[PDB]
A paper describes a structure:
Accurate replication of [name] DNA (mtDNA) relies on the high-fidelity DNA polymerase gamma (Pol γ) to faithfully copy the parental DNA to the daughter strands. Human Pol γ coordinates the activity of DNA synthesis in its polymerase (Pol) site with self-error correction in the exonuclease (Exo) site to maintain high replication precision (1–3). The catalytic subunit Pol γA consists of Exo, spacer, and Pol domains. The Pol domain adopts a canonical right-hand configuration, with subdomains termed Thumb that binds to the upstream (−10 to −5 region) of primer/template DNA, Palm that houses the catalytic site, and Fingers that constitutes the incoming nucleotide binding site.
As structures of Pol γ apo enzyme and ternary complex were previously determined, we here determined the structure of Pol γ–DNA binary complex using cryo-EM. The overall structure of the binary complex is similar to the ternary complex [root mean square deviation (RMSD) of 0.713 Å], except the following regions. Relative to the dNTP-bound ternary complex, the Fingers subdomain of the binary complex rotates ~30° away from the catalytic center, adopting an “open” conformation. If a dNTP was to bind to an open Fingers subdomain in the binary complex, then its α-phosphate (Pα) would be 13.1 Å from the 3′-OH of the primer, a distance too long for phosphodiester bond formation. That distance in the ternary complex is shortened to 4.0 Å. The open-closed Fingers conformational change is critical for the formation of a catalytically competent configuration, which has been observed in other high-fidelity DNA polymerases [see review (15)]. In the binary complex Pol site, Tyr955 protrudes into the N-site, and the templating nucleotide Tn is lifted from the coding-competent position, thus it is unable to form a base pair with the incoming nucleotide. The 3′-end of the primer in the binary complex is in the posttranslocated state in the P-site.
Numbering used by the authors:
A (entry chain C): 67 to 219, 228 to 355, 368 to 485
B (entry chain A): 69 to 251, 260 to 316, 342 to 499, 530 to 631, 645 to 663, 730 to 997, 1049 to 1235
C (entry chain B): 64 to 219, 227 to 355, 361 to 485
DNA sequence: AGGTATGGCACTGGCCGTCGTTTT
DNA sequence: AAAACGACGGCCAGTGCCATAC
């Protein structure tokens, strides 16, 4: 309760107190996130992109579209892109009103578009073209982050943003690569945690018999699924490309073989909620990890000649932004609050540091610094604060 | 009388009665017939007259017998307290300079025995004053020294004595020097050298109401006595044609040479290290005593110079009008608001974007040209074949596995390999070499990595660099451009055997053959100089606006833009690029030259408690606005003609479309409840020359043909000056305008024969010489009457040469002497055209002084609430509280009339033509403009003044509208 | 002509995707092509990050927003387009299977009333957040909301979906300032577009009036066949906000100076896929032209997708490979994108590699040799000049960081 | 015998400094 | 290992030309 109430008050979530419910957030049909949630998600996504893609010479981004055209496979209860305009188009004449009420069901099941359910199929549609980029060397990957659409339960739409990697491999080594990716993904989820024992893994088996793994986070009410790994084999590539298999071959061991497909997919909105709960563990504060927290530092102004203090705050604000530090410009508010409320507000926003500029800054350049973690206060000279902050961020990242 | 002889309309009955006496005199019958037969031989004796509506006024009471007595009494009353204060400085007995300079903040007065005492203000009637400024810190005054008749004084800035992390960069009067006293005769005089810079640092000088204080400048009195011509300046410096006697009595304007001439003794010493212009505040704190010593030294030398100069000035310009004029010229005042900052930002941004657009286009050409190095292909390009195409050597000192295991080991392995190889830096030379593998020409275009202003690419390139037109492959009439070291820019015409280094006779021949396919010698104009010795080609100069002997310094100059649109000058990269580059150059040329001066103007912002109540209690007042002023640093006499000089405002361009900066002046904006009123003298210098010619010939207005034409040519008949010139020989009226203005400054047959050739290409040189001969016979006549006479203008030139040949030339109206450095004793017949032009220019300066004296009188007499704003040689402006704005226009018109009548009186003419008596209009406006209706759209403010700032247009009123607004009275009762 | 040679390059270097038949002008302009190849995806990501930098990062009072892709709930009847209907929900006219005949048209009301729609613009969902986000700035009326995302457009054997990536600012202004802010943002965005352009004269604006007579501006790029629209600005006033929120206007008031007013909405919306295509056409294409046949894409350093190529000379393979791995890890740890050319066995000559990298628009080729193991010097070729220089390996990182960081200030 | 002033940039030659090569 | 010198790049003053004003 309290955590979500605070997250609504401080613009992590969006909507209203009636719409705020955990089951809706899990289902992906809540009203949406606030700006702080957007920034937090962008941080998660960039740390995922750097961890998975950047340092790999053979993982490439892929551009799957949001919908599938053409004729579907019938008998699926799922969304259709169909229009009442086309209901007047089909009636090119009035007299087509024959058996039409059942028949039109089979027609809309035959000729309509579909929303994207997963990123896998869009990646598989590019395999033959992207094989040229690696000079057909068989092990390579495609990665994408994007929203997918899921039927809920008068059904409604769940929206989920998902991070996906598809890894192609010789079948000889598939289970080794599976164990490797399980190791990396689990340790990636553990790095930023304040209690990494709350992240867990399990073995599981497909109804076929194929081997897979599942990753969980222990929310206060129970474990929830966050990410899944499956060794899918080769069925889908053959089904998507009947006929002359020799276009499917790449090179392993100086010989042609059909690759095996590994699928890795994680839900980032789940991850966001997991870290929000993890950070919250008499004071209250959200101790988000320094790499993830959306706004690093707040600037304020003390008592004195406002027009002089504001121009130096402006200079400091621009100095911090030029070096890539995100800043909350509290100095616009004229510090109408008492300092107790100002600290409580910043502790709930998970701000790392707060800087007060005062007459004495104009005298000698000393600013007050507070740290969110320690609640300790010290003086520092304005000249050096930027390099202190860069140091603190690097010494967080390298541990 | 309604008319005089020759039936020209003259000053109104009541006006002439009020201004002149009824006594008068008759010209004489012989003078009349001498005038009429002269007008007969020229064809002027037929009347286009259109009689102007008569006008009547109850003028303010004059003083004494005649208008000269009146103006003397006026100028004596204005000046007397300051000449009184000035006489106290001629007899001061200065104590010894104090042995140790005091450290404290503010003002300290020193007793004998050197005892420093703190005093809030110097409390003195007369002072010599000097201010020092640390240039690194900005514009705040740093320290100063003053001397009175009885004590030494010194001042310290709080920014020097204290230490702080920051000070406000916006200036306040609280950070300027206090000088004038709280509410003795107490009409303070301040004297200095370049005193206007010291004036700029005085806090009370920025208040919107006036002040008693006035300023006198040693440099301007030097310029009056023995100031040198600009050419004489370079001669005098080279000496450190054949008379050379003037050099011993003259000098340049610097304080050292002025002390040397007027005082002598041991030379003055500068500080060698120049801490105020190049040091930093730490150095000022450390070198303190030595700097304050050098300041007292310059102060003492200024005091010594002043005592010598004043009796000579009082001798050579005795009429009090001159001194009163100079003393009023020293108090200009320009109001500004917060829009100034926005104007500066918008101008800088627009200049930057246009310059970036130009640079990108040149940089792409520079980048692509590097590809000609391969295969020595550049030897065949008819441009660039002669650049530095050299390279400089670099200088030394003498499968299918699984996932990995122990990835952290391969990580540390590679990192340590990299650190190991990184450590070999010990073998590099200490000075980093600069782009040795790029070509030398390209090498020059790129900054060094050490420069804090480095950017990638050849980003130093400009249109005005000699490489640029080779890149654009500029072509003239089909011929490639070439640069000659002697002769500047020209072009190469191919085709010449007998040679009259791989390009010759080959590539250029092909290129021109191609041009001729697309449409002795075969070409003419600035004909072939065999001094330049390119094989195969001939070299021709580009034509210059000033004729063949000037050198063209860049094809991108304005004067070539017509030939681009005509298609005579063309670029290679295609028909869009050439004219667009020329467009941009025209758009930015003014801002390039002036942006440092304009952006570093010193501005002071007035707080709430300082403003008038008529501002704060006004409907148009705003909170969170800014109000302030700029004080121009005018030198009251900067020229041999005694004109004003100022680095910025006297050369500010008028608002123009397609010129980025032009709205500079429109940013001078009256505060709520105040207004700008002023006017511009109509055709001043032509009138002055005409009336001088009339006074010399026969003592009647319009007795000479040039005088009549100046008064009676109405453009519709063929009878103005320019129509007549265009009638004597077949040229357009617009060309005759040029010939006339040239001739007035003393041009002769070389000037006119050149312009003739330059305006009709069919003319032979002999025809031009003969037509110039005839034009000059018609205009000024023949040089003597035996074996000037017989021209429309002869008597004016006779009079001017008469004045200029006198043993002591004096200005005809007010009697100021010319400079000793130009009297015929020191200079036999050198500098003659300067001496002739001086008569008119100095007369116009006397006219300016008379107008200033009259406006100060009428404002103090009718308690008008207004202030002098600025002047620009022939314009004046006044800041006025809006309630008096219509009275101010009447005072201006009366000043114009009294000035015009005064001028004629000293020439011995007792009347004035009715047409010149008043300003064609007076301008009432909220900002400064050349015309009242101009909206001043520019590329930097394309929406114009009325939408960005809401300043409306104003009114332009003739005398009659001022009457119907005022009933003809200046009384506050109306 | 030139246009097809450009499209040949763009597919062969994987900026685009799919066959010639899928890449005709109409398909690209409509947004129903198969998608972009990986280099195009990186180019678009760079362009979007430059946009985010210029619009949001430095702008003290703009904030991010996240409008959903679909509209839930009940909807107005008579809008023509596709809706999220299903064959499962179709049974609400099939309660009796023997119903039939042209009476069916009743079911149009059912499908109109209770089926969702895919979003067509970003403004509407931003307006849904106005009341909530006005708290962020203590009602101080100049504030903005920005986001980037895909939009869906109906185009025309019957129908197809266009997908377009768009970037939107919604800016709230006190009514008297509205034309001032319009002119401000018009200049700002037009200079932003011109900043990266090689021929910024090909970008232009014109004034427009909507069918109701509200003022606005349109920005065009001059493709070789004609102008195409790339961005639009409108002053919309207050009506849409009033319609969104009927009743007590006291909820809507913000603070202007000391007085309370309802703002004018300013709407700014630009097309990023057309932006990408415009810069692709910009970057490509008198003896200095007649004989420099070189094919190259002069993409701006902030935009160009791949910055450095790494290659090896012949020599001891293990030593060169380990030093290249060190270089590669160092460069990537500082955010410089690198092509591992040292991993493809070197079939080509240097001329072929240079041609390939110039088609890929790569900024710099770095070459490692035997002599580097001794003196630590590496060769560097400039794309812009084709000249070769020597540089010591200890400085390369800082040189590249300088070059890119200063490219903003060229 | 075209007048009086202001000021900018591009370019050239002369000079002192210091770092690397030939030396007590 | 202190000391001698030579070549080269950096700094400034001076000359030339173009741009503003009346």
């Amino acid at each position: 309760e309290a955590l979500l109430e605070i997250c609504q008050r401080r613009h992590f979530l969006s909507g209203s107190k009636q719409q705020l419910s955990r089951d809706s957030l899990l289902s992906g049909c809540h009203p949406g996130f606030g700006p702080l949630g957007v920034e937090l998600r962008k941080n998660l996504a960039a740390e995922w992109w750097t961890s998975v893609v950047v340092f790999r010479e053979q993982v490439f981004p892929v551009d799957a579209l949001h919908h599938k055209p053409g004729p579907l496979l019938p008998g699926d209860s799922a969304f259709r892109l169909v229009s009442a305009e086309t209901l007047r188009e089909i009636l090119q004449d009035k007299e087509l009103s024959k058996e039409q009420l059942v028949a039109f069901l089979e027609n809309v099941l035959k000729t309509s578009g579909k929303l994207r359910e997963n990123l896998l199929h869009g990646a598989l549609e590019h395999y033959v073209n992207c094989l040229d980029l690696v000079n057909k060397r068989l092990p390579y990957g495609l990665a994408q982050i994007g929203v997918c659409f899921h039927p809920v339960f008068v059904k409604s739409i769940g929206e989920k943003t998902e991070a996906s990697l598809v890894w192609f491999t010789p079948p000889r080594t598939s289970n080794q690569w599976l164990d490797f990716w399980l190791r990396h993904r689990l340790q990636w989820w553990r790095k930023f945690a304040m209690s990494p024992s709350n992240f867990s893994s399990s073995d599981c088996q497909d109804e076929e018999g194929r081997k897979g793994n599942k990753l969980y986070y222990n929310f206060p009410w129970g474990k929830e699924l966050i990410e899944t790994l499956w060794n899918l084999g080769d069925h889908e590539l053959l089904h998507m490309y009947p006929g002359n298999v020799s276009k499917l071959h790449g090179r392993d061991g100086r010989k042609n073989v059909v690759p095996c497909v590994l699928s890795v997919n994680g839900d980032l909105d789940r991850g966001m909620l997991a870290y929000l709960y993890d950070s919250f563990q008499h004071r209250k504060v959200l101790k988000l990890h320094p790499c993830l927290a959306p706004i690093k530092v707040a600037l304020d102004v003390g008592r004195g000649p406002t027009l002089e203090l504001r121009q130096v705050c402006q200079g400091l604000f621009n100095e911090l932004l030029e070096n890539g530090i995100s800043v909350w410009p509290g100095y616009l508010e004229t510090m109408q609050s008492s300092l107790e409320q100002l600290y409580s507000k910043y502790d709930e926003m998970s701000i790392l540091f707060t800087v007060l500029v005062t007459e004495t800054t104009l005298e000698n350049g000393l600013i007050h610094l507070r740290s969110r973690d320690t609640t300790m206060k010290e003086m520092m000279h304005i000249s050096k604060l930027k390099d202190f902050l860069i140091k603190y961020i690097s010494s967080a990242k390298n541990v | 009388l309604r008319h005089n002889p020759l039936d020209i309309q003259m000053l109104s009955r009541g006006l002439h009665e009020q201004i002149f006496g009824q006594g008068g005199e008759m010209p004489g019958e012989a003078a009349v017939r001498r005038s009429v037969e002269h007008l007969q031989k020229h064809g002027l004796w037929g009347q286009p007259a259109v009689p102007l509506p008569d006008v009547e006024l109850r003028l303010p009471p004059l003083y004494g017998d005649n208008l000269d007595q009146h103006f003397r009494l006026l100028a004596q009353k204005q000046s007397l307290p300051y000449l009184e204060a000035a006489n106290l400085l001629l007899q001061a007995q200065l104590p010894p300079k104090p042995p140790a300079w005091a450290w404290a903040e503010g003002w300290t007065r020193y007793g004998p025995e050197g005892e420093a005492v703190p005093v809030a203000i110097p409390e003195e009637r007369a002072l010599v004053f000097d201010v020092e400024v640390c240039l690194a810190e900005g514009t705040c005054p740093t320290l100063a020294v003053a001397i009175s008749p009885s004590a030494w004084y010194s001042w310290c800035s709080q920014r020097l004595v204290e230490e702080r992390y920051s000070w406000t960069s916006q200036l306040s009067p609280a950070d300027l020097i206090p000088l004038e006293v709280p509410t003795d005769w107490q009409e303070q005089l301040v004297v200095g050298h370049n005193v206007s810079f010291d004036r700029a640092h005085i806090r009370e000088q920025y208040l919107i109401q006036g002040s008693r204080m006035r300023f006198l400048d040693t440099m301007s009195m030097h310029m009056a006595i023995s100031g040198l011509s600009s050419f004489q300046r370079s001669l005098w410096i080279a000496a450190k044609i054949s008379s050379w006697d003037w050099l011993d009595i003259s000098s340049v304007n610097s304080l050292a040479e002025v002390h040397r001439l007027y005082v002598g003794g041991p030379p003055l010493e500068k500080e060698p290290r120049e801490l105020f212009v190049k040091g930093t505040m730490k150095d000022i704190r450390e070198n303190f005593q030595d700097l304050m010593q050098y300041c007292a030294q310059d102060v003492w030398a200024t005091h010594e110079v002043f005592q010598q100069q004043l009796p000579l000035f009082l001798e050579r310009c005795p009429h009090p009008v001159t001194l009163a004029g100079m003393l009023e010229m020293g108090v200009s005042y320009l109001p500004v608001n917060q829009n100034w900052e926005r104007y500066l930002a918008e101008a800088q941004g627009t200049y930057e974007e246009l310059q970036r657009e130009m640079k990108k286009s040149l940089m792409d050409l520079a980048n692509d040209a590097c590809q000609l190095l391969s295969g020595e292909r550049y030897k065949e390009d008819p441009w660039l074949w002669d650049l530095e195409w050299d390279l400089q050597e670099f200088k030394q000192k003498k499968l299918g596995p699984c996932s990995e295991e122990e990835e952290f080991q391969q990580d540390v392995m590679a990192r340590a390999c990299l650190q190991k190889l990184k450590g070999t830096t010990e073998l590099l030379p200490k000075r980093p070499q600069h782009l040795p593998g790029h070509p030398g020409w390209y090498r020059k275009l790129c900054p060094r990595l050490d420069d804090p202003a480095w950017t990638p690419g050849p980003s130093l390139l400009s249109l005005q660099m000699r490489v640029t037109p080779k890149l654009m492959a500029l072509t003239w009439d089909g011929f490639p451009l070439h640069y000659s070291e002697r002769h500047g820019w020209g072009y190469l015409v191919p085709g010449r055997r007998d040679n009259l280094v791989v390009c010759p006779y080959r590539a250029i021949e092909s290129l021109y053959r191609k041009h001729c396919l697309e449409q002795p010698s075969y070409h003419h104009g600035n004909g072939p100089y065999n001094d330049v010795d390119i094989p195969g080609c001939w070299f021709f100069k580009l034509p210059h606006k000033d004729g063949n002997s000037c050198n063209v310094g860049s094809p991108f100059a304005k004067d070539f833009l017509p030939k681009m649109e005509d298609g005579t000058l063309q670029a290679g990269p295609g028909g869009a690029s050439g004219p667009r580059a020329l467009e941009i150059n025209k758009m930015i040329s003014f801002w390039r030259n002036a942006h440092k001066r304009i952006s570093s103007q010193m501005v002071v912002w007035l707080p709430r408690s300082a403003l008038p109540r008529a501002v704060i209690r006004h409907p148009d007042y705003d909170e969170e606005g800014l109000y302030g002023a700029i004080l121009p640093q005018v030198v009251t006499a900067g020229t041999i003609t005694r004109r004003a000089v100022e680095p910025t405002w006297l050369t500010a361009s008028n608002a123009r479309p397609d010129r980025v900066g032009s709205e500079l002046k429109a940013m001078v904006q009256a505060p709520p409840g105040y207004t700008l009123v002023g006017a511009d003298v109509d055709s001043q210098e032509l009138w002055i020359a005409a009336v001088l010619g009339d006074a010399h010939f026969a003592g009647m207005h319009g007795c000479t043909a040039f005088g009549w034409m100046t008064l009676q040519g109405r453009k519709s008949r063929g009878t103005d000056l320019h129509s007549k010139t265009a009638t004597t020989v077949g040229i357009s009226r617009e060309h005759a305008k040029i010939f006339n203005y040239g001739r007035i400054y003393g041009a002769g047959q070389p000037f006119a024969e050149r312009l003739l050739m330059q305006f009709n290409h069919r003319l032979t040189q002999q025809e031009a010489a003969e037509k110039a001969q005839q034009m000059y016979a018609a205009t000024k006549g023949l040089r003597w009457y035996r074996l000037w006479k017989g021209g429309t203008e002869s008597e004016m030139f006779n009079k001017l040469e008469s004045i200029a040949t006198s043993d002591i030339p004096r200005t005809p109206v007010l009697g100021c002497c010319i400079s000793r450095a130009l009297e015929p004793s020191a200079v036999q017949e050198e500098f003659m055209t300067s001496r002739v032009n001086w008569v008119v220019q100095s007369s116009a300066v006397d006219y300016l002084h008379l107008m200033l004296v009259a406006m100060k009188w009428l404002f103090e007499e009718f308690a008008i609430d207004g202030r002098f704003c600025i002047s620009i040689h022939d314009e004046v402006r006044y800041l006025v509280r809006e309630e008096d704005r219509y009275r101010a226009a009447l005072a201006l018109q009366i000043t114009n009339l009294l000035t015009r009548c005064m001028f004629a009186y000293k020439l011995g003419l007792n009347d004035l033509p009715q047409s010149v008596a008043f300003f064609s209009a007076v301008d009432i406006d909220r900002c400064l403009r050349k015309e009242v209706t101009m909206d001043c759209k520019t590329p930097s403010n394309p929406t114009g003044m009325e939408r960005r700032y809401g300043i409306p247009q104003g009114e332009a009123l003739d005398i009659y509208q001022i009457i119907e607004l005022t009933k003809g009275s200046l009384e506050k009762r109306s």
